[PDB]
Design a binder for these strands. Sequence first.
DNA 1: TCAGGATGTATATATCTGACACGTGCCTGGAGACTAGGGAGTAATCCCCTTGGCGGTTAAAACGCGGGGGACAGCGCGTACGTGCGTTTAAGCGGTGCTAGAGCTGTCTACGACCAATTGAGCGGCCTCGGCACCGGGATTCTCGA
DNA 2: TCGAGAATCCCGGTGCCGAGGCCGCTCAATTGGTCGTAGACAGCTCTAGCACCGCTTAAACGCACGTACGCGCTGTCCCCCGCGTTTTAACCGCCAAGGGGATTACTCCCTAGTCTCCAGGCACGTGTCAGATATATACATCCTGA
Lengths: 87, 86, 580, 107, 107, 98, 95, 93, 93
Amino acid sequence: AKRHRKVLRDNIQGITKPAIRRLARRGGVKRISGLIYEETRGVLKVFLENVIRDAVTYTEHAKRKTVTAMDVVYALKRQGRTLYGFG
Amino acid sequence: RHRKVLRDNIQGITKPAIRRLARRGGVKRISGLIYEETRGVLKVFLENVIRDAVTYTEHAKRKTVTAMDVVYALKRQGRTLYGFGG
Amino acid sequence: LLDQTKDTRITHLLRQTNAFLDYYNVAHRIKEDIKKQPSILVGGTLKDYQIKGLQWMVSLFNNHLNGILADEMGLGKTIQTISLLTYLYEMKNIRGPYLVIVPLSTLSNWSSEFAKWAPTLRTISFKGSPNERKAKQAKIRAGEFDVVLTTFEYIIKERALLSKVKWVHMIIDEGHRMKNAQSKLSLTLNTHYHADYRLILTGTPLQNNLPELWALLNFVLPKIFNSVKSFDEWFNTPFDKIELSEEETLLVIRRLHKVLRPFLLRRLKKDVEKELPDKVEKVVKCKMSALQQIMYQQMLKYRRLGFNNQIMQLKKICNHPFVFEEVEDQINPTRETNDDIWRVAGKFELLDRILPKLKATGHRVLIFFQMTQIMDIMEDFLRYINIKYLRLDGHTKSDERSELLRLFNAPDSEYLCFILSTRAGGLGLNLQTADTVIIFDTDWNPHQDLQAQDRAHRIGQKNEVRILRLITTNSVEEVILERAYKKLDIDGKVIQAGKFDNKSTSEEQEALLRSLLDAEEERRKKRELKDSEINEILARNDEEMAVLTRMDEDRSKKEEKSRLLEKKREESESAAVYNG
Amino acid sequence: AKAKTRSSRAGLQFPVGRVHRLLRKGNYAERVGAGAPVYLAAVLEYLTAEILELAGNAARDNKKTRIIPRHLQLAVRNDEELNKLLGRVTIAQGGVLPNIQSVLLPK
Amino acid sequence: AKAKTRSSRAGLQFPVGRVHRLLRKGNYAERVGAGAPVYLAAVLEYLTAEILELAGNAARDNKKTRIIPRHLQLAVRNDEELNKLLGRVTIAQGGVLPNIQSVLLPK
Amino acid sequence: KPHRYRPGTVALREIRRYQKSTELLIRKLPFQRLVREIAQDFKTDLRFQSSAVMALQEASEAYLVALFEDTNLCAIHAKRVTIMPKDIQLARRIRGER
Amino acid sequence: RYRPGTVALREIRRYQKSTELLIRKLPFQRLVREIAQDFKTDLRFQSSAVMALQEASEAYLVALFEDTNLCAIHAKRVTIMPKDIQLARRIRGER
Amino acid sequence: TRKESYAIYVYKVLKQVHPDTGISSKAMSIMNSFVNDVFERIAGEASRLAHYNKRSTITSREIQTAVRLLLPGELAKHAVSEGTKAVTKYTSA
Amino acid sequence: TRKESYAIYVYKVLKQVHPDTGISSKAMSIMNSFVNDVFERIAGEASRLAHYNKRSTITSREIQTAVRLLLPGELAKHAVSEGTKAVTKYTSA
DNA sequence: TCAGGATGTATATATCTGACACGTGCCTGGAGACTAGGGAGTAATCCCCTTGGCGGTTAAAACGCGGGGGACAGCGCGTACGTGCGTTTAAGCGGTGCTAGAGCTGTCTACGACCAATTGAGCGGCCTCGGCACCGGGATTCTCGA
DNA sequence: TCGAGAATCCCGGTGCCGAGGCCGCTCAATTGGTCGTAGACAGCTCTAGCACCGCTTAAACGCACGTACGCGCTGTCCCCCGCGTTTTAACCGCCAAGGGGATTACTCCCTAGTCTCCAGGCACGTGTCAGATATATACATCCTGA
Ligand SMILES: Nc1ncnc2c1ncn2[C@@H]1O[C@H](COP(=O)(O)OP(=O)(O)O)[C@@H](O)[C@H]1O
Ligand SMILES: [Mg+2]
């Protein structure tokens, strides 16, 4: 029946239509097609996959289970994405 | 000993040669204004890389530029070159 | 013997309340007693205990200090409070302003009672978005009000409102939600400035962790703030059995009851109305099953012996297995509910033993849940057994909460088992028609007892109330059961403190208190499938024995496989050994 | 024999001693120079004063006494070469400076 | 007391002693481990054998006994992940692998 | 007879309102569940600090804004004011990622 | 004769098939000496240095024409213009 | 327990450039990470720069060519002027 | 006078992979610069990796996370296997 | 569908050539022995993150729904380089001389490194207060249509 | 070519909370006093970079057609925009316990220096073999044509 968690809105759709809409509006774009949504969700999942891979690599190296801010700052700063304000 | 002055020291890259250079890149149809712009971007790239190279050669207190200095200039430039050392 | 030092502390700090606008002597220092109720009170008469407690709180207003009503649910804190507001509004002529704070679920009850019993007192409510709230906001900004309703969230949302106005006498409700010390709402009421005097109200006294502290022993009383800061551990060291809790610290307990005399007021319902005919408080004992057998401990082995297992593993897989539904595809790849899928759990065996008997004997049973996955699976097999029922949850939105009760209370209805959670309803559910309660897992606090048990025992149920508390053998949720039950029976001093917090007969706090200290001295003494016994625990009388033994003869001829599902072996061990 | 910090001898703000130590223990080289931490102190003086000064100009333009990471955003990306240094690196809370394409906007 | 190179103890080719020294004097850290130069020796074994093996396959495909930087070019950019490592870095004398766009070529 | 705006004016008003403001755009909790769900794939039962999730959030937000800006330039180069999948994958194809 | 566009394929295949250096040495030599004369006087370049810088700028510029080709074929125009060749280094992050 | 930051140094620079202008906490942290990152670039590049010359020590000339080679543009000229000025003023003390 | 190169090591790898296949001088130099560059990546990144943990020494785990974090893809798995195999074989000697 | 057209395949030979096998000197890896310090372990204290639930409040998000305009094939027309083709011609190459400076070796100090006393400088807690944030309400301001 | 209407900025009034000073602590900076040692000059080698100088020949170039195609123009719808209305879940707060990061502090153990003799690799020479310029050959393949 409905007891199974298999039937539910999947997590990647958690980014909504007006969310990514606004997020492109900041980019300076006017008219947006319909597949920009799915394609951009794919891109976001790939990028987050890479950065979180590096992050869990650092945190796993220190033997800690806690992913900290300095971790992500090291992943981005190593990828060329260096991020100020935190590290 | 002497200095031989021959004109066309900037655009001296010939349109057949640079045209071949684009043909290696896989381009099909080449315009007539691609050549000047390509000499511009090549000139600017050359600016940066030779600026770094002569920075290294100047730091070492030597009057001769060496291939290793170019490999380091390209190195920090973001593209590492292989086969010439370093 | 720090109560004399506390008498000095109240000698120095006593003039804060009145000036800034025998230990009873400090509260007896002014001599007046008035038993008479307010004359303008309309809609009925006050009960004897209502007149006594009302005279007690008004007697506190005579000395003007703060007070506490700790008494049991069902004794009418409402009419006592609003009667204090109309009496204090009438005779004493201080007349206001008054601030009341109640949960939104009860705001309809309080708002409905303030009309009948106090027509002259003008009130104000807050609901229906800032559009409808802004009108009465403009009404209150002018300073026109007497008794103003509000809820907890409108304290922080109306922080501007309450900040722009200075109150006089506040009386709040639901003190056991407010109790939290680090609660943002409590800090905002510390930055609230103040009114003159405050009244905490809670249906149940301190529960769970160590004695009062955060609520009444800090937040309620002015002297108690600065005084009891350090002493919380000094008086909390009681909680190494006879030599501590009994020998020396018995008098310490006597002082804990001696300091709370003018403060708390608590009375048992059985001492006044006592309309409850009786109850039955028992338990049962279950045992493990296929996944709940050593495979359970085997999971504890390969996994330990994500994280936080010992707390998480219980409420999931000692109630029903494959609530993760990941291993459900292993045990039952057909993703289809068939016989003996729901019987792989050890606890459920007892259930599907009772359900045929309650279906035959026709009794409507209450059931309380946690881990709503159990509600989903139990609901699906509950559809497999083909018996009617009604659901509820925290997502109900209150539409089915209000409308559903009219479908439940219908006598002709065939709905038997009634689905509930432990936290749902906020004690406003009002179900008097079910005589039986069963609970899968034991809550961490007595609110299981004083909520789930007060659903039945409340007025309107004249039958015998039967309770079945499930537990499994050789498990840690055992030591959670005796931990919460036995280790949280420390409040037994307080539930005893209700009886001598009442009119307090002389022998109550020594002779009868000791008679309870029997139950204090049998603690360790209580630390130490049968179809006939489990059949008879639900039997009220003999003509029920006739029909249940008739069922015994009904299933005596027919064979009713095995008891439950068993570890055929390739499913059991191969489950969790490939995960890690 | 009075103790005088050599950071004040060069008339600077960023400390010479701290950058000297941290540079040593930063295992950048097995031996360190004398005037090198002074020189780094100087270039950090000029960079911090530069970018922070542009931030002060942006905050003054926005009529705000304090400075916001938005003001550092405008400070960075307003200047050409300063953006050329920080172009590859991103930032936090700054945002994007207003821009609209020519033919994208209507008449 | 017979001298045995520890590079042969691990059954490797790249020297452990040279990478150990050069790693020391390379001022990467103030103290160096024991099995670290062995581990680097191993990963250099696998990388060199990998890319050089692909170069051998390309040279075998071109019917050439020796290898040319063109063969290292094809070796690099033929493999996916190996190109992902060397994508950002350029090369010398290799050239570009043949490619033609789909709709660019006529019918 | 109601009143409305011509198509394309609301776009300018929006773009100005967002580019004018520094506030974080995508909503926190859905991104939280996204990071936890995607990190569950690599190693189990990780624990993220709040500043870590805010870090990764603001980072992916800024980079993705840059991606839509690049896609906008490629679109307006294509003479189409509408952005498609083609040019948004051409942005990260020309960047050197894909 | 040949139809227009076949010679282009034959060329592209001939070049991409071969590894030989393309632009001619000596003009590039005079270019590097002339452009280095601006920074510091009377520099001395080794042969391997000029070959280095040559092959580097050659490879990078080939990559530039490849990206310009992708941008052009995206624009639906098979002809490359100044617009897309400056859009390549504008989108790369240089200009 | 002890977390070191440049902080009050950037504060003093702010007070000697724009006295009335203040700075927030986020701005102090972001510019702290700024000077840390730039320092890491200059020193980290001067390390390998002194390593290519087989010179064991890092000196003022190494940082000189490091900052001259690091940040492009006219911005380097003022850094060279202020740097050499601070070195000469330091040695003349 | 003395210019070191890996050389005959790459030669031995060639002879244990493709015995009949030869290598030119340009190929030996370009792959020499290859292993030099890759080594510079791994060790150079393991340095700062051990510096972020405030660990003064570089060890086998530092190079482990260094090579695992450096080169993406399935290519890292075989490097980890061969690496740990060589470390265990070294210590078991 | 077929003939003669301007480009790439395989087959002997030969032919410089530079990779590789073979053989010396020599600078650096390596084992053995002897001294010091870096990190892993156990163990209380306090702060932050988990994993299952509750009660509320709104701003955002979803679903229609008309409807405006831009993507999107087609259609012509005018350039615009593509493709030979004689005609210059400057790059490649081989072929000397001349010497600037990169590189190596040898001494000799100015200089960091390390260590012992000495102490202001920078960082945490405490406390206080302007500056940014929020709220009606009201004076333009560009945009939607006559 | 012009006039109303929703948006936007200008206004004070609260209002509340990080930013800034202020006080006190403690520990890295600072100041000498040896002391071993890179590197700074100083001189000597030689070798590779820089001059023509002449010969040889693919390479580039101005110029002639001649179709390829890029751009402007034009209908045709289909997709996204801007409202307008439900609806619903993020956002707080609350609860129940539990466990994971830190900071001193003895305690070992693994790799820095460290002096000693011994063998692996490379710069330098013989002395032989894979490949590219050099020749001639049906086939792979495309344009004109039908
Ligand atoms: N004196 C009284 N006369 C009539 N009804 C009363 C009286 N006191 C209490 N009640 C009943 O009690 C109900 C309210 O009880 P409530 O105040 O909710 O109990 P509690 O104080 O335990 O929360 C009312 O519906 C009312 O009918
Ligand atoms: Mg009541």
